[PDB]
Design a protein around this ligand. Structure first.
Ligand SMILES: Cc1cc(/C=C/C#N)cc(C)c1Nc1ccnc(Nc2ccc(C#N)cc2)n1
Ligand SMILES: COC(=O)c1c(N)c2cccnc2n(O)c1=O
Ligand SMILES: [Mg+2]
Ligand SMILES: [Mg+2]
Lengths: 556, 416
């Protein structure tokens, strides 16, 4: 006998204040009972479970299920109740690697570690909570009672404890063989390297010898699995990756559910297929969640879908990461708040792609959205590669300079260069810092009745120009915006406007270039046509000349 | 040598805060730092039965090239019991902000000499992530008082009071104040003498140590007696335009919310009619008097301003352009406890976010010196931009709380 090292036990507790499960065993057919007795006898022979006395008060139900197209039964121990009562664990697998961050490998070998799983013992003090009962033939003797000695399949703690146990065993081997990579997924170890194949096979045998120190054996007959690997929705090859096939179905009509599935596929495809768009299809899903409802596709949605089919017509692949090279991220504006990007190291060899959509809200502009996309790509890049890419952006250096030096918020984008690929992001208007000599001064105001929603908006100027418009279905805030719109409409190319609306000033001072409000869009359209606009604020009802005059005209 | 029992607040579990993404260089720095800390027994590897987590990252302190581990214990601190057992609390020293020079020392290294309560250690768990999650994150917990945890200075206080005793008795006029990992040492000596006392002070810790701290040698020098405040000032002009008077009435109307007696009747009367913004308006005698009276009112303190230690401090910041930033600290609106302005934002001429991050640190330092706690910031920045970048410029061993302002305040105009 060659001594083997024990696997360190992980101590396990129930949640505070909770006791173990006490769930009734269901009656079973004589056939099912006989099947479970044989299965459990073998598990007992193998050391996985042990018979227990009558003192243990806990129980979990056990079932027998017929393995399809076979005459063999399988046992199922339903640990749902125990799982509700078992502590939370550190779950190492929460974040999965993105293929674009992997490194090219010459060789990747798969080792099956399913047998090692049953060398991981269950914490002695916790075993009692895993008790289960095979009912006896005809209920005429006490049922056979068992508890687990190993991590039960289906128990809450098994994946984390198994994974952590393997990691601890593998740590010295990885550390002392820095020329390989090791990744565990389910019951398999993946071992990659760039060694010539003879040396790579030597390392695999050395890993098997290392694992034997803990008595863990792997199958000599090498795995049937070999590149390419289907993993987490991807295809991995030694020197490239892609998504598993993206097939958009043909339909004569589309339900809520169909469109959700379509967008899900498109989102997934968008990490390597450049230029995928989902705005118009997602617009069809607004607010309603009856999955069977049939939604007619708009012309815009049909066009978007046709454009997506053309993008997906043939395979696209990503390359892997070379740490010796810079990362480059390039962004394009697609319209309607949509942005698309590519990340590469060598021209025309993308590592991955992606997209960004405008956040929901009342007002926005292209510079803010571009900034948001940059921050998203930066954070994603830290995750995948541990560094920020150099950016290529469709905004002139002077435009960015004007934006950030004058914008009321702090803002930053990391090292970047202008790329001249239309449509370019620009500033559509810029308010004056000082009043304009020689430009007419428009004093604006509005008022609305809160019950009837009738109101008025208008202006008076230093030249004696005046206008008041009676309005229906409006509010105080809306009339203030309407009054500014009137002043813009009726003035020359340079205009000074005086408002007492903190609200209206707050909107225009945020510099939107597009809005959910048609009124704000009309104001934006007017601002773009002006040569110079100075917008001044004053407090209402403080005896200021022009302001008090127009206030009287609109509040009567 | 024996541990002080610690518990969480009733009905709360440990922190479960996600580790944010770290750059390659910071991960490598943390792997080296934690490997040494593990060899020294300060931290130990943990298993999957510990589900708690606190974020960690790495910084470089001001004027140093060596990486420092920084754990963001904000969540654990909120969840940790309060410490009033031996003392109700250490009365904040009002004399500290009155000293000609205050030097800040990093004494956090002292905490590693005291063991941490075995049953509390699990709640200090943290993770060194791997790039692209390719390998399982390296999981540790503390065995000793951690830097940045509010319990560390509280538990170490009895040790600190004894270590400092001969120096205080020998220097009765020096003010010494501990906040987290910082020791603030204020005196009225000529700087040369001041540094020698600071250097005298380092030797007590070193002497105690050997019975070597990586950042104890360093020194952040402040001069709170020269700290400057921002009263409300009105323009002095010979030619007032319609626009100038409108801005003045706006500012006075705002100030009327803070000061009683502010009048604009006579100033507004100047604008009667419907005038061009650029037209020059001569001040009347009545308007000049009203302005003068307003100026006199604004020279006086705000009425009824008091600090309540049971209430949060709030700090607002405005970007003024050209590297200038204004800020106000209050507990109640319109009751400022301090106001200020920076233009000296260091090494950040083309980076708004680095400037704001430095402003945030400077304001927090001022708030610690004056009141012994940190304010809640209202930051003029989008959340996503702030959270992407602030850790790149952070140099302090504490971290305040913050929220984000999305609508431009008019108040920027009035502190401008
Ligand atoms: C995350 C991961 C998933 C699988 C696979 C899981 C499954 N199924 C296999 C391995 C070895 C790894 N780990 C790493 C780490 C660094 N580079 C790589 N590069 C790399 C991996 C696979 C192929 C291929 N073919 C090529 C390169 N893999
Ligand atoms: C009696 O009227 C008012 O108190 C009044 C307002 N509170 C007001 C507030 C914001 C903007 N504009 C306003 N205007 O125009 C007003 O007239
Ligand atoms: Mg109004
Ligand atoms: Mg009005």
């Amino acid at each position: 006998m060659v001594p083997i090292s024990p696997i360190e036990t992980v101590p396990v507790k129930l949640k505070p204040g909770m006791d173990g499960p006490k769930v009734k065993q269901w009656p079973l057919t004589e056939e099912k009972i006989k099947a479970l007795v044989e299965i459990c006898t073998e598990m007992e022979k193998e050391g996985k479970i042990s018979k227990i006395g009558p003192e243990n008060p806990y129980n979990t139900p056990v079932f027998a299920i017929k393995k399809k197209d076979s005459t063999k039964w399988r046992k199922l121990v339903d640990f749902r109740e125990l799982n509700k009562r078992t502590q939370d664990f550190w779950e190492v697998q929460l974040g999965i690697p993105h293929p674009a961050g992997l490194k090219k490998k010459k060789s990747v070998t798969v080792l099956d570690v399913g047998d090692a799983y049953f060398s991981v013992p269950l914490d002695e003090d916790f075993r009692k909570y895993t008790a289960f009962t095979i009912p006896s033939i005809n209920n005429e003797t006490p049922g056979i009672r068992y508890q687990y000695n190993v991590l039960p399949q289906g128990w809450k703690g098994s994946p984390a404890i198994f994974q952590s146990s393997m990691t601890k065993i593998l740590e010295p081997f990885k550390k002392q063989n820095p020329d390989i990579v090791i990744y565990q997924y389910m019951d398999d170890l993946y071992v990659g390297s760039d060694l010539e194949i003879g040396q790579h096979r030597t390392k695999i045998e050395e890993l098997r010898q290392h694992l034997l120190r803990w008595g863990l054996t792997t199958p000599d007959k090498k795995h049937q699995k070999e590149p390419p690997f289907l993993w987490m929705g991807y295809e991995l090859h030694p020197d490239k990756w892609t998504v598993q096939p993206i097939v958009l179905p043909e339909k004569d009509s589309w339900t809520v559910n169909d469109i959700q599935k379509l967008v899900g596929k498109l989102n997934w495809a968008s990490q390597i297929y450049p230029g995928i768009k989902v705005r118009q299809l997602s617009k069809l899903l607004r607010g309603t969640k009856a999955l069977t409802e049939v939604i007619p596709l708009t012309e815009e949605a049909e066009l978007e879908l046709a454009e997506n089919r053309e993008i997906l017509k043939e395979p696209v692949h990503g390359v892997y990461y070379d740490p010796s090279k810079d990362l480059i991220a390039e962004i394009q504006k697609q319209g309607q708040g949509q942005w698309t990007y590519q990340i590469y190291q060598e021209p025309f060899k993308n590592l991955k792609t992606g997209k960004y959509a405008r956040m929901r809200g009342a007002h926005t502009n292209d510079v803010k959205q571009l900034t948001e996309a940059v921050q998203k790509i930066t954070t994603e890049s830290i995750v995948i590669w541990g560094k920020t890419p150099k950016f290529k952006l469709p905004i002139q250096k002077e435009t960015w300079e004007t934006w950030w030096t004058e914008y009321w918020q702090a803002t930053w984008i990391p090292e970047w260069e202008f790329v001249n690929t239309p449509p370019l992001v620009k500033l559509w208007y810029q308010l004056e810092k000082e009043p304009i000599v020689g430009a007419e001064t428009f004093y604006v105001d509005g008022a609305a009745n809160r019950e009837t929603k009738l109101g008025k908006a208008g202006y008076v100027t230093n030249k004696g120009r005046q206008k008041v418009v009676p309005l229906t279905n409006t509010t105080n805030q809306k009339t203030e915006l309407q009054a500014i719109y009137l002043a813009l409409q009726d003035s020359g190319l340079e205009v000074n406007i005086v408002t007492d609306s903190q609200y209206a000033l707050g909107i225009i001072q945020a510099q939107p270039d597009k809005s959910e409000s048609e009124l704000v869009n009309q104001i934006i359209e007017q601002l773009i046509k002006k040569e110079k606009v100075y917008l001044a604020w004053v407090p209402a009802h403080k005896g200021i000349g022009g302001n008090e005059q127009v206030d009287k005209l609109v509040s009567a | 040598i024996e541990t002080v029992p610690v518990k969480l607040k009733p009905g709360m579990d440990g922190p479960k805060v996600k580790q944010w993404p770290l750059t390659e260089e910071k991960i490598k720095a943390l792997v080296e730092i934690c490997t040494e800390m593990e060899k020294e027994g300060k931290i130990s590897k943990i298993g999957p039965e510990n589900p708690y987590n606190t974020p960690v990252f790495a910084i470089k302190k001001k004027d140093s090239t060596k990486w420092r581990k920084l754990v963001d214990f904000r969540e654990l601190n909120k969840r940790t019991q309060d410490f009033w057992e031996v003392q109700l609390g250490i009365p904040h020293p009002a004399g500290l902000k009155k000293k000609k020079s205050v030097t800040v020392l990093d004494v956090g290294d002292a905490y590693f000499s005291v063991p941490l309560d075995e049953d509390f250690r699990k709640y200090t768990a943290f993770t060194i992530p791997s790039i692209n999650n390719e390998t399982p994150g390296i999981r540790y917990q503390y065995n000793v008082l951690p830097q940045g945890w509010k319990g560390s200075p509280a538990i170490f206080q009895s040790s600190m009071t004894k270590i400092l005793e001969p120096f205080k008795k020998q220097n009765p006029d020096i003010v010494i104040y501990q906040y987290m990992d910082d020791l603030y040492v204020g005196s009225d000596l000529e700087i040369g003498q001041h540094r020698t006392k600071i250097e005298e002070l380092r030797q007590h810790l070193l002497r105690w140590g050997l019975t070597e701290p990586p950042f104890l040698w360093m020194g952040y020098e402040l001069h709170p007696d020269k700290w400057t405040v921002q009263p409300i000032v009105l323009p002095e002009k010979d030619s007032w335009t319609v626009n100038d008077i409108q801005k003045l009435v706006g500012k006075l109307n705002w100030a009327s919310q803070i000061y009683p007696g502010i009048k604009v009747r006579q100033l507004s009367k100047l604008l009667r009619g419907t005038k061009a913004l650029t037209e020059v308006i001569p001040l009347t005698e009545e308007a000049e008097l009203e302005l003068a009276e307003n100026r006199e009112i604004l020279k006086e303190p705000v009425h009824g301003v008091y600090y309540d230690p049971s209430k949060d401090l709030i700090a607002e910041i405005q970007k003024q352009g050209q590297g200038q930033w204004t800020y106000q600290i209050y507990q109640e609106p319109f009751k400022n406890l301090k106001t200020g302005k920076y233009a000296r934002m260091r090494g950040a001429h083309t980076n708004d976010v680095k400037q704001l991050t430095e402003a945030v640190q400077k304001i927090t330092t001022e708030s610690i010196v004056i009141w012994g706690k940190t304010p809640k910031f209202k930051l003029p920045i989008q959340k996503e931009t702030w959270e992407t970048w602030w850790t790149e410029y952070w140099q302090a061993t504490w971290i305040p709380e913050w929220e984000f302002v999305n609508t431009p305040p008019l108040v920027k105009l009035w502190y401008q």
